[PDB]
């Protein structure tokens, strides 16, 4: 039978997947030592079970992503049938290849670090480049927002009709053309000094793309947006990071709203920014989990 | 403990221009089919303590090609070679590079895990589909691009260049196209496939195709017409992997391109004798630059800002 | 009662017929090539918590089924399959066993760790050329062997079985020839090329060559027309793999053969067009017995002992 | 080949002087954090053909300091460096060396493999909690002693030393004051819990440990051995740790003086604490750097120091 | 439930005999001999197709040619097609050397980890490791099981003045094992490091305490040390009953009271020659750590109780 | 640069000796004993650092100690950071199971082949594998030496009627053994076949040779011997690279009508021959010290098998 189990990222998220699934929590004690070490005690067997750990890249990084490792190893030790990683949102995904000189290509060794620890299968969302499903040789599940977003659009987007929905940077041209396509809208190329390259005349522009991390670009091309003259900006990012002055961008920058999903908790930067609005998706990790509990 | 360079028969002549700009001869390899169609290896010199270098390209029969790298490898490696590096000019089954669809497989991570079994130490490639591929491995994987040898290529042959706009065919091409944009310092357009859609105006000046290859050509060759029908003063299709597979030629020479041009990461000669609008960039002195900084054990870095010769 | 059967493009006869022995269907692939001639592979139905064995025989175009053999193998895999077993009646590469030379690949043990490295949790393989290729993994390997159904085609096919000589084209075939001659109580021959050297008798006797494979038939036609020089009543030739390659097929016109039976590792239609003198021994029930054993628990030692049908 | 020694963000004190006592300079890396708290690592000169030494000690915020020490192993594997030997002072989640509890990781273990999958070749460390942790790979693993520094301190700074005491505070601790009252030929005690075996009557009295962590158990025991009657009491571990209310607590107690290397910086801890005393290790490592270059034994760091 | 094997190699028959016995099982079909020019030859004459397999072998007698069986007997149930395969070994041989204390030192004990890794055990299950941190030699779950609850109703049950006992360390190593006996029957311990007792064995009973007996000098020379103390008597329970070379000739002229072992060795062949030692036998922790271990229990009880 | 250190196991010191004598080196420095319990004690009383070590096991006499010393040794000098280790193992122990002939049967010479592997070994140096496809149990680069040169050398100088002898196989698997060595001294050939035993050839009037890998028990060499004599040969010899001689094998030998029984040093033979008068020793030290020193500078071994120096 299951086991859901939480890390000290995103109890929330854990709590509606195994609410989903009908579950308890794993019964968990997750802290840290004195010195800062993390500290994993499970406290109920897992010997024969299918256990899924829910961490997601978020907060303290390598804090959450050892604390991972550990609950991985111990529930290896543990006798468990099968260790499986949800990870909503995969750490250390941009460095993805070996873009100059003497870089390291971390996402790789995250993948191997997981494999070692004893990981058999992997559930993320919306992989930054979906090649990391590559990276290891177990079971990697890229799941999508692309139907939460169209959702969301469709059912809030007054003029989603003739809307046109926009790329900050190059790299995510191929997410947007996907769900213009399924819209059936125009769409538009954001590049940095910015250029726009579509048209957006009085029409509602939808940022999107993959991630915002400290959302300088999407506040920047919001901004282009304006300047092309486009009646209202939007930004749908799969992954809320708002690190460091983010909320401050997002705050005075000209959008209607900004919608994330909850692979990373948001109520308190939801407090601070009245622009945020945060979309389900822990209904898609727990038909991952049931789909792959055979 | 120096060189000892092999070709395989998917491209002998690139293998040839390597060894010679390296003052080498090339290594004594017999590669050919047995009876019932098994890759025949044969070695004809001793490789022990060598640094060996196989010159292997995805392309023609592509899974004969691959098992007889892999053959050549692991022969090598048993022969107590000393490091053996597998130099892959076009990477096959890069295309099979993720699980997008229900059931599909992740060819270019398992032809990658062949390479690491078969006793691959380092892999020199060329304008990877995807770069990612080069965390497929747990070896070094150079990622060479072919962008100076194109704008090279640009600036000496277009006259018009200044004012140009280098055109994505597709949505993922986009990245390359604003890179070579941005070191020209000219416009940037994309084309996307639904009727097929241009955004950034091409009007009444040069329009330049640049993407990472060219298979079966109909996506460059309708992007070329719809270049044509939004005005365009010259249409050129600049692109690293000269693949030309089905009714390429049929469909260049049928289309409205000046030149179309690209690497000789694949054989060209005999696509260049059917089609006079081909232009080949050779790009055997940034394979042989890569080889003897890998050997020497420097900085390959040089090979992205300048162009050798 | 979880079991899917796939096939690949190279014997999709004997795929059907242990199908049809299983009581199941063949799963859904759709398995061809792509413009660039890179495998094409979608498994077609979910294969997750199944136990899925893909028959795939070393022959035809020997990398292009190898490779679509690996690429269905890492699909299943990936696919959360509880195991996946690759069922090679002909294994390639598999002469390819040793050093013999001074610079020598093993591709035997290379083509065992690309199976491995793809995924493959087992082995079930008819009568290796040598049984050590069962060291080459670490993993279960079923060799079966055709002796069982060649006693029993000899017995009720050769009249003057009782009193026939079973003999060897080569040196190394002794203990399959040995065994055979034990077995029906009958002489054995040894024929060494070296003008070749004949030992043991065949004189007024029917004389039965056996061997694992056929692939260019020069040695056994050779061998033949001596058995017949030393005075011998009839020639048989009695192989398991057919293969049939390069001038196989004329050479076995020419021979004088009253018979070359093999077993349908290898698709044998094409090859009985062309060529009167063979005769074909359908072995899909032992490979389908070995698969409905290797499911339940049950030990396979029946299959080298009788015939299932 | 030729020998390029980085540090990490922990300690680069200690690289420093390594660094300074082989002859050579720190290489060039950049070693920080991204805005939402991914390490980045950019190496800034060739490590090609080279045979690379990365010291970063398990101290400060661990996981940080341990996945960027990761990162640079990876980096300078695929920079094609000929050998990378991960220099780790304090071995990070050493106490997890077992399962004596249900459900409990061996997180020792796991960071020996996720150094060994990093690209580590061979590593040099200190004075392991357990010495097994040398099987948790199958690579070299020298575990220095800095037991030849400590008898260097104590003969050198104790008076007494010739009718002292040796005291282990908890039981697990036995062996190691073995080998060095042994090694002074004196008296030893132990103590647990807290109740005392051994003499430490009109003796002074000297703990030694492999760390002090809260040193909650050694400052008891310290009061415990002045409750037996010893002149003054010492505490000499390799391991500076001091986290939580370790200064309080020292500061509180009765030491004559507690002793460190720096295998952990200290200096901090120094400002904020007039008990604490650090014993430089730095050539010890830098030895065994040398030797692990050219090829010889570091045998003789166990015996003899610089 | 019952799918599972359970085999015996060529080291302790009896303990093999009694685990069976006490799961309600028969020992699995396997003839254990050697080639004629001394190499192991191991046929199993029944299908482990789908099983899961225990094979019992402890690290004793012939000690090589029992581990080589051991290795060959995992492999061949590997290549059996067997769902698990579980090396339980009461004493786990090589790991007095798990550490690099000298140059050129090979970490023996981890070689064999391995060795058994690689030949294909899924599970390990042992009793009282040298050194606990071999569990961390291997991968996979290794259950470190003890003898302290058996030695402990021992105690109660044989030392009439077990309340004012002492627990007292032959060596510097055992100090956390007799702390531990100590608290557990609050009384008072001791230690033995030439020769110095460091501790208060008044004039009352010492119980020396290790996880094994090689040759027994060790122990031998701390009873002498605790004669000359002053102790009433002294006694010796240790897990493995190892006892080679001239053990018993000195366990017969040492002071010992009793010498108390496991059955992890076989000792009826020590018994018959020496009055002195007596035995605990432990095969009921082993048989419900099998049982456990099958259909996925936990053993924690094993270490709070004592099952018959 | 000589880097090469050589150690010497406890199975045949004087083999180890006379090797690193004829490579003009001194023995290292090991003291390989027992604990009392019988555990293995290898201390290495030298440094290996940065070297080239050989440790030469050969597996015989007490088989389980010295592979288990040798495996200690290598994992030694493994964690000792040499440069590479390189197992010397004249015999190669459990060569006789390679495959699985009979149900859940082990194949105990590829766990042997893992074992080296995971100790460390870098380089296996062996000679006359009982199956050659052993050399494919690994993924290092295996040496298999032949003693075919020196046994073709002793016949000729020792023998003197071979010109016109016959080279026979004791079973029916050593044939290829046999046709090999009779076509380089151009004699004929025989085979015996235990069915009651049957001759295969013609033997009358001329000297028989029986020549296999190894003799263990001799208990076919000794009944194939008497069959020679009843088929009428001049002379019987027995040649044998492997000369275990376990169990009964001197016995029998003793009342054996052999004119001669030469073996190689692979395995020790001075106790052997002082209770076997027909015991001839071929010394093959020179081929294992020139393996040696060809594999440590980096030299075709090829030259060894026709040679012997
Ligand atoms: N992972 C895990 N280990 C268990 C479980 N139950 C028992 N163990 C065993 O417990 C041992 C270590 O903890 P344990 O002995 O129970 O703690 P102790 O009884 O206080 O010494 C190992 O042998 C484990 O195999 C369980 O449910 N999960
Ligand atoms: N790879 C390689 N192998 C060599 C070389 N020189 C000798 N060999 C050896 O040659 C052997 C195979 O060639 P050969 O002696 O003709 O085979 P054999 O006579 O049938 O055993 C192998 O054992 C190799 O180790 C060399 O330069 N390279
Ligand atoms: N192999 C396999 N993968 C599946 C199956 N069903 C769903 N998936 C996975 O589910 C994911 C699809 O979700 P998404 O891309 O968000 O639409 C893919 O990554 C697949 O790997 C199945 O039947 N077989
Ligand atoms: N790791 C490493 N990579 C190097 C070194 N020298 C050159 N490279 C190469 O630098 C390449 C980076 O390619 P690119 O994305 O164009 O970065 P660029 O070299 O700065 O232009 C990598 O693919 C490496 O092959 C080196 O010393 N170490
Ligand atoms: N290990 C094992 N092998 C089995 C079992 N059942 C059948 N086999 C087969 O046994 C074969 C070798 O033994 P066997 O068939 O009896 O003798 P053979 O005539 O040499 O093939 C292998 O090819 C296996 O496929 C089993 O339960 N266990
Ligand atoms: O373009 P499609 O033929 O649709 O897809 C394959 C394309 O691959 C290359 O880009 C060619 O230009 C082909 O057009
Ligand atoms: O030897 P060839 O006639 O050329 O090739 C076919 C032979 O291949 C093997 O030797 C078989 O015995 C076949 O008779
Ligand atoms: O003392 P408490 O258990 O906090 O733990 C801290 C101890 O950690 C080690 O034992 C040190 O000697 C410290 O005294
Ligand atoms: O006493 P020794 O002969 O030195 O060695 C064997 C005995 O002492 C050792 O520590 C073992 O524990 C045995 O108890
Ligand atoms: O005669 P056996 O008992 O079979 O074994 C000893 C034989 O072992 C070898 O294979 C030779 O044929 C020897 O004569």
Redesign the pocket.
């Known amino acids: 039978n299951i086991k859901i189990f939480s890390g000290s990222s995103h109890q929330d998220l854990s709590q509606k997947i195994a609410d989903r699934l009908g579950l308890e929590l794993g019964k968990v004690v997750t802290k840290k030592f004195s010195n800062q070490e993390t500290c994993v005690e499970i406290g109920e067997s897992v010997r024969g079970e299918d256990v899924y750990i829910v961490q997601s890249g978020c907060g303290e990084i390598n804090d959450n992503l050892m604390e991972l490792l550990i609950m991985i190893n111990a529930c290896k030790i543990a006798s468990a049938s099968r260790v499986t990683a949800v990870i909503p949102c995969f750490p250390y995904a941009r460095q993805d290849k070996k873009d100059k000189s003497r870089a390291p290509i971390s996402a790789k060794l995250v993948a191997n670090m997981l494999s070692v620890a004893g990981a058999d299968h992997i559930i993320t969302m919306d992989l930054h480049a979906s090649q990391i499903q590559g990276f290891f040789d177990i079971?990697v599940?890229?799941?999508?927002a692309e139907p939460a977003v169209l959702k969301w659009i469709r059912e809030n987007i007054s003029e989603w009709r003739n809307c046109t929905i926009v790329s900050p940077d190059a790299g995510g041209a191929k997410r947007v053309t996907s769900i213009a396509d399924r819209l059936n809208v125009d769409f538009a190329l954001i590049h940095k000094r910015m250029v726009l390259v579509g048209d957006v005349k009085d029409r509602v522009a939808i940022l999107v793309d993959d991630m915002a991390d400290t959302c300088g670009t999407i506040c920047h091309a919001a901004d282009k947006l304006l300047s092309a003259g486009a009646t209202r900006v939007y930004a749908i990012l799969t992954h809320g990071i708002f690190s460091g002055p983010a909320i401050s961008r997002i705050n005075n920058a000209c959008f209607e709203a900004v919608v994330v999903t909850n692979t990373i908790p948001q109520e308190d930067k939801m407090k601070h920014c009245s622009k945020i609005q945060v979309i389900d998706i822990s209904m898609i990790l727990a038909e991952?989990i049931r789909?792959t509990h055979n």
Do not use: F
Not at 141 to 144: E, F, I, K, P, V
């Open positions: 079971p599940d890229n799941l999508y991952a789909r």
